[model samples]
Target: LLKPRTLADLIRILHELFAGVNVEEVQAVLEAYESNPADWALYAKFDQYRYTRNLVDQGNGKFNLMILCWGEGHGSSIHDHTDSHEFLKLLQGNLKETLFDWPDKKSNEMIKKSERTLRENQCAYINDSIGLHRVENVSHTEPAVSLHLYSPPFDTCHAFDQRTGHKNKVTMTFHSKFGIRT
Candidate 1:
């Protein structure tokens, strides 16, 4: 049971929420794709995924689809987009989401980012303007399921870490090409 008046509408709404994203439509998108717990064909292939799927239509593409199958102790590091936008949707299971922004000058310097948690069916928008954040699986035995839509499509992203000063240059792979070479 996915919602948001279709993916296109959701993208527009999310772009506004996160700021600085231009998602025109879903030219090549995956609507509602789910696998049976008993179906091992797809599941066996994706044990612990960290990649994405691109949408292509009539030789033209505009967005990307990301599916996360996280395991115990699986999580993402603190990072932000470089003038990009994302729309995230939780499909099944439970997970935690942490949102961070530049702390006030009077605040503690030790903590560079703030965080929070989002459960199943919960959705939100994220863009470079939101600053740095992290998403993680709260359950140890179960996998967290999520969907991400990136506008203008995405190939690589610039990863950064503020606490470590300038260890801030990292290249993130795209979501569509997850297991082609690996």
Candidate 2:
């Protein structure tokens, strides 16, 4: 499919593509958005701390689309998404994603397994099987923007404490809705 012309257009495509698809299929549809950075022009915004703005909230239990804004040196804690699948597309600036592996199932000891720096138009897909990971804006002075699509619309996730290997459930909330901060 051709790239969307606006944010609404992208949202429409998402609804059409993911109406009843499986996790793997959702990732594929999300990749379509990742391939077109131009479609993300409408959602690009940055803040002093990482924040998310809801673009489309499916309303039922389908999925949710959001734009994540990141300031220099800002990022997410190493976390797991429960059962939801996540697709992250770097719309503007730079992002560093580090993937980790659990050394033992009995313990929360996570070891860095892989890492990558994504630039504009690049993306990464994650699920429980991918293990735990963290995303950060690599620039020290430049802000970054990323578009995210979460399947099944997760309400909570487990964030890991690097020091103690403890996992805490965090309730998620949006910084903005429909382009307005709330």
Candidate 3:
């Protein structure tokens, strides 16, 4: 867990993490782990983990970064990046990635998105087209750790239904604390 800290330290981390960001021109927000043995915490158990997305103004949409520490799992159902671009950097642990493809416009069915495994220090780029995928912890013993960078800073996303073939607008929640504004 994070010890007693001040705003300066957090600011520094955000500055370095989003050095070239172009959004609101400031570190939007951040969340510190609220548990112990930080390295051994389970991701799925970390509810606030989703709130790390401090959006950076990237002109068109926005840019943001999320750090899923050790023993964390962050995921979503099949969906696009909402016509935006996303990048993932695996800082530690291992993660499993699955990419999906839509066969045709008439058919909403998705062709199997290829499954790929990522380890420490690996990186991936995703967008509206290629970013339709899913991710999770690849190992139960270890956590899936990563840094996500989204371009054109944003908080609105679309959730797709595999059964209904419909898209629903979703407000991206930050660390499960603040509500997202589309």
Candidate 4:
């Protein structure tokens, strides 16, 4: 059995995995982490918006590691990763991830392309080709938390308003650092 580890161990391994690697190597790295969600301790926070804690923001844009805590019935707006490679591992609760196709080939116009339901211990990957998607904690009684790893970490992303179909760039911010938010 894999022994419980710290966030530091998770950080070091990811840096080594992406520092100098090929596509196959990257996939191998992701596969390993996805299958081992219990290796590191995870914490969640309640917030009006999904609370995100940045555990590791590496040098030279290698990767950004964060834990997102979603309040009951809360989720992210339909958004894009600004063409970055990303992966998400569901650590707790149930989540539904919806991926959309830009039928008009416009960011403002999206059609439901696919949907995935992830329970604890499940994981998903999104390449640069994945442009539009949204993640929701579908439980009305409990919150959800997940670990997200983004390559070439982003400072800004495009978010879409479902009601108005307005697309705009928004700056990303963390609710906490090292599990503390004040």
Candidate 5:
């Protein structure tokens, strides 16, 4: 396979290559991509209110690729990605990921399982099987950016409350489309 030299090239290649939820294949693709920040900088826009979700490619329907901008102190709640497979690649700055066990069957309480930090160029693969997670930018002066590929594209996911284990289904909206910020 020809290595992608630009973000557009990467998207075009993925559109042709991604046919289904193949974890290994996606992992391989994530391992090598043209990393020049200029290629992705336009998609990396941060919001003071919360993180921003900018579409990179819709993947027709087989998958979706997006760039997420996490402003200082911004983070997502404990969330489940339904049945889709997630491949998150940190593109700029860093993010701390906290993993948690699903709400207890009876107690209805969530328990923290572990935590880790993802630096630039590092990739993390996650699915419901591994548990739910929340990612945040801990930096006070800088924003973080990451590229995420979700297979079997999902539009809604469950965001859980940490204390009561309550969950709400929320629609994922884009802050930008095709690198044109909204």
Candidate 6:
């Protein structure tokens, strides 16, 4: 039998795969990998006030691979990922994602387009062309974990308020890098 794939293997594979931008090919590969808890369990370090962004790989600077640990009731604001394609693979618990249209230029109003919940091992993809989104851990008592890949990694992204359509540019930071607290 072939050896099981770990995060290291996945990371290495993605680095080369992402040398060229092929969203379909990348998503197909992403959908094929099963979650191996033993490979990434050590990286889960959740925060009570918010979701923690823990870096897993720099992806040779071609993309970003990170593990996001979420506490109960934590989530993100509706946000756009610059020019990157974001893939989120659920590792634990239930995560609810809500998609929204770009804010109106005149009224600054945003309309909800869709929403769905992702279970363990399920993957979701989004980008500018797809629209903006906000994600949250749906559980009240349990935590959640997700593996995130952002190709053509970006430094800043815009967050929009669901109600007010207010937008702000937020600089992304890491709670950990390579599993070390940062």
- Report the number of the highest-TM-score candidate: 6
* The 10-residue segment with the lowest total lDDT in model 1: 51-60
Q: Which candidate would rank higher by TM-score, 2 or 5?
A: 5
lDDT of the structure predicted as candidate 2: 0.73
What TM-score would candidate 4 get against the native?
A: 0.79
TM-score of 3: 0.59
| RMSD list, candidates in order | 6.8, 2.8, 8.3, 3.6, 1.7, 2.1
> lDDT by residue for model 1 over 1-30, one digit each (tens)?
133455345445444433432232321222
lDDT of 2 by residue, 27-146 (tens): 554555543446555455556556555564553457777888888888898898778788887777899999976446455556788999988867788888878899988788878888
Mark the regions of model 5 whose C-alpha exceeds 4 Å error after superposition: 107-109
| Candidate ordering by TM-score (highest first) | 6, 5, 2, 4, 1, 3
Candidate 5 TM-score, true structure as reference: 0.92
Write the residue-wise lDDT of candidate 6 on 1-182 in tens digits. Answer: 12227777777678778776878767766766688878897788777789999998888889988999999999998899998899999887889999998888655568999999999888999999989999999789889999999988887999997777889999997899887988
Candidate 1 vs candidate 3: which has greater lDDT? 3
Cα error, candidate 6, residue 10 (Å): 1.0
Residue-level lDDT for 74 in candidate 6? 94
Which candidate tops lDDT? Answer: 5
- Candidate 5 lDDT (Cα, whole model)? 0.86
Structural similarity to truth (TM-score) of each candidate: 0.60, 0.83, 0.59, 0.79, 0.92, 0.93
lDDT assessment of candidate 3: 0.53
lDDT of 5 by residue, 108-178 (tens): 66899999999887888889999999999989988889999988889899999887788899999899988
Which segments of candidate 4 are over 4 A away from where they belong?
A: 1-7, 21-43, 57-60, 103-109, 163-165
Residue 146 of candidate 3: its Cα lDDT?
A: 63
Write model 3 residue lDDT over 63-173, tens digit each, in one string. 554555434455566667867666665656777878866435453656665888877656667777664676677465665556566765667877766654466788875
